[PDB]
Amino acid sequence: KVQTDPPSVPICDLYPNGVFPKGQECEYPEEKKALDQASEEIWNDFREAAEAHRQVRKYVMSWIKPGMTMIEICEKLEDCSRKLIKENGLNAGLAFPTGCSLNNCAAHYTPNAGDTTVLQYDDICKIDFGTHISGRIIDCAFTVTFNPKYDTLLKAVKDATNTGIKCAGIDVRLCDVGEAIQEVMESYEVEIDGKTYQVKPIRNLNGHSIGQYRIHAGKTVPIIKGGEATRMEEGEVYAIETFGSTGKGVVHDDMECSHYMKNFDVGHVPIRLPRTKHLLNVINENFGTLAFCRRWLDRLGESKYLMALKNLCDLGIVDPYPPLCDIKGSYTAQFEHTILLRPTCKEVVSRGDDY
Ligand SMILES: [Co+2]
Ligand SMILES: [Co+2]
């Protein structure tokens, strides 16, 4: 068909032949064309997930408004994402929980059950959500504001993310990408409520390579100078993300934890404790090595699971990822895209007409 008003038609039904739209293709800063075409089914899975991400976020920008609760915003977004990705166990679905981190919090907040937080006119909210097909993950994120006082801070971070995307390429050193991002970000000065700031990158947050069912595959993309001279390689996939702040430019763990994920390297572990065994089975069936949140356990009918969840964290089977925040009173912004380092070109697979 054509897509519906509030979106409800799965991306795979909009593109009947199984061939999905490319993202932005870029020259990097024969045999390789054969090598590129050999992985076409993989690129196509990323593109299906990226078109779902494009259509979901456009819909979100149409209705997100102060006065909504954070739970209402997350549930309305995730409902649409499940429909457009055509959720099907671990073959298609949500790759990680909807981040909606506010103000000084830069990442890894999503509400748990009972959270009464309401979105305000002066809030700066980072919407970070992920889709996948067959474990091929799109990690892409943007910042929502309603007061025009944050416009230059948003522009700084968007320009820095685009600079990291342009610098990236096969054989490029990851430390060079960081230096480049920081140079652009720090070229911006902003004025918010009568105080001026030079925008600083959050130095202990980073982009990351992506692997199959593995949001963090092991290499990190720094956003300040001073990092490793490890090179980017042909065939790798990266989330190029940057964060800018008016605070210290450093985040710490804060608030209640909502995001959790099985450690990718831990094998099978026999458990006899009944509630802990049941919860690990629930995680293995529904999430595998993809991240989840407490709201997603509640939705599956689980209750009284918090001690079993703590047990799995203390065993090192699951890791907790608490919200990461700069100092009180500071403002943080984020923009992110997923890029594929194909043999013939760099594709910014999650690029849209919006950002
Ligand atoms: Co992200
Ligand atoms: Co990311």
Swiss-Prot record:
A divalent metal cation 1 binds at D128, D139, E336. Its EC number is 3.4.11.18. Substrate binds at H108, H216. Contains approximately 12 O-linked N-acetylglucosamine (GlcNAc) residues. O-glycosylation is required for EIF2S1 binding. Binds 2 divalent metal cations per subunit. Has a high-affinity and a low affinity metal-binding site. The true nature of the physiological cofactor is under debate. The enzyme is active with cobalt, zinc, manganese or divalent iron ions. Most likely, methionine aminopeptidases function as mononuclear Fe(2+)-metalloproteases under physiological conditions, and the catalytically relevant metal-binding site has been assigned to the histidine-containing high-affinity site. Also manganese has been proposed to be the physiological cofactor for human METAP2. GO terms for biological process: protein processing; regulation of translational initiation. GO terms for cellular component: cytoplasm; cytosol; plasma membrane. The keyword Transferase does not apply. Keywords: Acetylation, Aminopeptidase, Cytoplasm, Glycoprotein, Hydrolase, Metal-binding, Phosphoprotein, Protease. Its cofactor is Co(2+); Zn(2+); Mn(2+); Fe(2+). Its main location: cytoplasm. It catalyses: Release of N-terminal amino acids, preferentially methionine, from peptides and arylamides. It is found in: Cytoplasm. It comes from the Eukaryota. GO terms for molecular function: aminopeptidase activity; initiator methionyl aminopeptidase activity; metal ion binding; metalloaminopeptidase activity; metalloexopeptidase activity; RNA binding. A divalent metal cation 2 binds at D139, H208, E241, E336. Interacts strongly with the eIF-2 gamma-subunit EIF2S3. Binds EIF2S1 at low magnesium concentrations. Cotranslationally removes the N-terminal methionine from nascent proteins. The N-terminal methionine is often cleaved when the second residue in the primary sequence is small and uncharged (Met-Ala-, Cys, Gly, Pro, Ser, Thr, or Val). The catalytic activity of human METAP2 toward Met-Val peptides is consistently two orders of magnitude higher than that of METAP1, suggesting that it is responsible for processing proteins containing N-terminal Met-Val and Met-Thr sequences in vivo. Protects eukaryotic initiation factor EIF2S1 from translation-inhibiting phosphorylation by inhibitory kinases such as EIF2AK2/PKR and EIF2AK1/HCR. Plays a critical role in the regulation of protein synthesis. Belongs to the peptidase M24A family. Methionine aminopeptidase eukaryotic type 2 subfamily. This is Methionine aminopeptidase 2. It comes from Homo sapiens (Human). The gene is METAP2.
